[PDB]
Design a binder for this molecule. Sequence first.
Ligand SMILES: [Mg+2]
Ligand SMILES: [Mg+2]
Ligand SMILES: [Mg+2]
Ligand SMILES: [Mg+2]
Ligand SMILES: [Mg+2]
Ligand SMILES: [Mg+2]
Ligand SMILES: [Mg+2]
Ligand SMILES: [Mg+2]
Ligand SMILES: [Mg+2]
Ligand SMILES: [Mg+2]
Ligand SMILES: [Mg+2]
Ligand SMILES: [Mg+2]
Ligand SMILES: [Mg+2]
Ligand SMILES: [Mg+2]
Ligand SMILES: [Mg+2]
Ligand SMILES: [Mg+2]
Ligand SMILES: [Mg+2]
Ligand SMILES: [Mg+2]
Ligand SMILES: [Mg+2]
Ligand SMILES: [Mg+2]
Ligand SMILES: [Mg+2]
Ligand SMILES: [Mg+2]
Ligand SMILES: [Mg+2]
Ligand SMILES: [Zn+2]
Lengths: 190, 176, 47, 76, 137, 115
Amino acid sequence: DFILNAQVRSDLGKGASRRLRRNAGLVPAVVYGGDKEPQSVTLELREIAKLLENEAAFSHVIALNVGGAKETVLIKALQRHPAKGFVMHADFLRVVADHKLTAHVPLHFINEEVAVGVKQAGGEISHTISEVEVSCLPKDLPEFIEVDMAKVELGQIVHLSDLKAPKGVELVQLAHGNDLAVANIHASRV
Amino acid sequence: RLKEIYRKEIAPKLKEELQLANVMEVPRVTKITLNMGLGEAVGDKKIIENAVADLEKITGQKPVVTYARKSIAGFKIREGWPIGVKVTLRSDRMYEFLDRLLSISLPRVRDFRGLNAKSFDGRGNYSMGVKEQIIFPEIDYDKIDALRGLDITLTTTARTDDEGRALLRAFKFPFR
Amino acid sequence: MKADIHPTYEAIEATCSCGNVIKTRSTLCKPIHLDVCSECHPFYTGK
Amino acid sequence: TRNGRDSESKRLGVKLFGGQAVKAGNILVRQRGTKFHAGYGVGLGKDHTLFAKVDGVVKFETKGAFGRKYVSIVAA
Amino acid sequence: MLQPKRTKFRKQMTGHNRGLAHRGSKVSFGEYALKATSRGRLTARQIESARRALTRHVKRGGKIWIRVFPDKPVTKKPLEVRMGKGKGGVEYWVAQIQPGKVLYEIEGVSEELAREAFALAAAKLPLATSFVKRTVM
Amino acid sequence: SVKKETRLRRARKARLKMRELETVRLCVYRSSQHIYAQVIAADGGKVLASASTLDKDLREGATGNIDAAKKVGQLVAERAKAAGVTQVAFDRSGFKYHGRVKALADAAREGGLEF
RNA sequence: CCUAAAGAGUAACGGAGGAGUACGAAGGUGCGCUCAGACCGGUCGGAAAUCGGUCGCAGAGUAUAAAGGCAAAAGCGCGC
RNA sequence: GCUUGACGAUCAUAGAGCGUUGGAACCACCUGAUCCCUUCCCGAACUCAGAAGUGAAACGACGCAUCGCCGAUGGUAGUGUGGGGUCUCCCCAUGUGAGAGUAGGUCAUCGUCAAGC
Ligand SMILES: [Mg+2]
Ligand SMILES: [Mg+2]
Ligand SMILES: [Mg+2]
Ligand SMILES: [Mg+2]
Ligand SMILES: [Mg+2]
Ligand SMILES: [Mg+2]
Ligand SMILES: [Mg+2]
Ligand SMILES: [Mg+2]
Ligand SMILES: [Mg+2]
Ligand SMILES: [Mg+2]
Ligand SMILES: [Mg+2]
Ligand SMILES: [Mg+2]
Ligand SMILES: [Mg+2]
Ligand SMILES: [Mg+2]
Ligand SMILES: [Mg+2]
Ligand SMILES: [Mg+2]
Ligand SMILES: [Mg+2]
Ligand SMILES: [Mg+2]
Ligand SMILES: [Mg+2]
Ligand SMILES: [Mg+2]
Ligand SMILES: [Mg+2]
Ligand SMILES: [Mg+2]
Ligand SMILES: [Mg+2]
Ligand SMILES: [Zn+2]
């Protein structure tokens, strides 16, 4: 499931880190956060690359296992090769039972076939954004935020305030007094 | 004078009519500034000191000539050239000009049911225009030059125009 | 107030047609006879 | 072409660095304007030149509001 | 042909093209993209040529973004002209491309149709390319 | 306020010169009711001699006028002498050197210390 | 000013601009003061004149190109 | 030990905003313009003589992270020396190592003198 294995990294630097990717086939990583000193760990590339095609990979909670001591983490940021695209570095944020945390949550758009602006007016659908910054307690962190586009007419805009959210979830950008277009309907290009 | 009228009845009645908690925050009027923008005399320069005398007798106080802050050839003017004159009044001298303005001159202008009660900036100040200078006494109609539009501004210590207008309801301003 | 650069300022009088006498210091040095004032102007009365 | 012009270099910059011993009248920095301001023991020439007025050691401190960079002379 | 409406200076030095593209290498607006896997420079006539080939194939709906803008002038000295005597006049405009830069984006079409259209465009460009989907991060 | 902030900007130029020259400064402060005088050592660090109308021989009320400041000006000179100081510079601290501050200064000169 | 490779210097028929003056006050000193701009209110002028208020902090200014400076303003006004 | 006033050290982890509060003393607004003095007009500002009112404005203190400002660990880019390749560009050994971003922090900390408890 959401299981990752790690070993304690000891050699730090550019030359040491370039050697892991070339010979050992491992990936440097960091486990910071919580109330502890940060820990530098390493993990195998073919295992992190297999957890990353799960759709709810970043918005779920991982069970990291460093050596024989396991704990609760979350994919906080990720580094990829600009050209090839594989992952080079990754950092994990520790999860505390009573502490607010932030995450990136993808949006599950639904029932676009029977939208009023598409079935009747013959318009298109454009997803302006595909994830939203959220902030919530770990116990109620959603896998996806569901946006419903059934009763949408041609030219009608959908903003952050339009979509619903589960309990105890803030949209961060909305809290900053900045709601922005999520999706819209418009006439065909040609 | 109007000094006696403000600090014995006008101020105490406004104290409860705005429901103000403190005495010092009761609104008051500080200064009256008149000027007149002489868009003429761009090539004349003779009427500048003529309009000085006109505004000198109206107030009993010498005016000062205000200069152009920028050239802008659209009005055919240039920096350092005189555009207008101005006066500023305070304390007793503006409670005696007001009384003459209140009713010796405002009734005899030509017309009007009242004054526009909507000429208030967002901060509680009132400014009114005057079309003909002859509305005042102390200037004979038979001796003046061409008519010119004196101007009036009332600067008050009002937070907003609600108590600013309320203060001008006192002194029984002619508001239509 | 500076010295001797301003016109004379005296109390004088002001008498209106409606039997109104008002004291007001101004620069005429002579009593005046008026024709209108608030005690007699139409729009100051209700018309 | 209508471009082939330039001007002689003026040899500007710091002449004595932090810690160097100085004498009275020694030129410390040559400037256009004042990248550096005259601190304690230093004077300002009419072309914005910093020269020593006492004997000591260059300091090169930045302090005060405005984030100014000061050149001062201290005890040796 | 894309080119800036006005420029501060008419000419530029040749410069050098170095480094990978850490900025401009993410699928930001669209949902499928054509990334560059080799470095070079597009001449603003290939950018224009490769855009006919991409919108013509979809020919039904879809939104297309162009993430490359040619803003660097280049000069060519005329024929039968010696060396020196100034710098040549501006001929055309190019764009510096580094490995990993995303060139074209598209959405509102099937994944299979996106692959066809981006192969039409890539044949007009003088550098290696790739097909990239979109990720959360 | 606008009034105090503007004055404290007026006072700035004179005080900057007096630390470049590293001279002992006689600083005066004038309020609506009282007036104060301090002898600032060399750079604003320590206060050497000080006097005002608040000491226990001038607490009577006639404290905001010309002849009240004269008694302060002569008194601060005496306390300055006990500290072995002379040849000080006068800081009007942005106030116009015309009235109460001038009376304080002139009394200081008769006190013995020199400007 | 860039080329010029974070001390100085550094070439090309390399890329861009200026000078061959002005000022008896546009210098000295003492004292005093902050600009451009936006909005609102006001007699004709109206997007833009002079006036009042709020915001703003230098996006103004510097005799003259560009660079580097400018609150003790190096910017502005007055007396001697 | 505490409060108020003056002068400094340091220049945002110290600022901005948004709320609460202080008049016994201090400070401020305040009363008046005969005298000193002032306005390219005006006691608005400067100045003088004060003690009837209010802490309304201003100032000070106290709270909050909303903005601002600080900001790690790790990774990445560049780079001196020696050696390589498919040599417009990179790689290896070795030393060095940002900028941006992430977790987070901040509603300052001191010194001298004078008044009141
Ligand atoms: Mg290396
Ligand atoms: Mg040139
Ligand atoms: Mg050239
Ligand atoms: Mg040269
Ligand atoms: Mg040079
Ligand atoms: Mg000199
Ligand atoms: Mg070249
Ligand atoms: Mg870049
Ligand atoms: Mg000055
Ligand atoms: Mg330059
Ligand atoms: Mg150099
Ligand atoms: Mg070098
Ligand atoms: Mg050579
Ligand atoms: Mg020439
Ligand atoms: Mg000058
Ligand atoms: Mg001069
Ligand atoms: Mg205006
Ligand atoms: Mg200043
Ligand atoms: Mg006063
Ligand atoms: Mg930062
Ligand atoms: Mg590091
Ligand atoms: Mg590093
Ligand atoms: Mg950093
Ligand atoms: Zn009448």
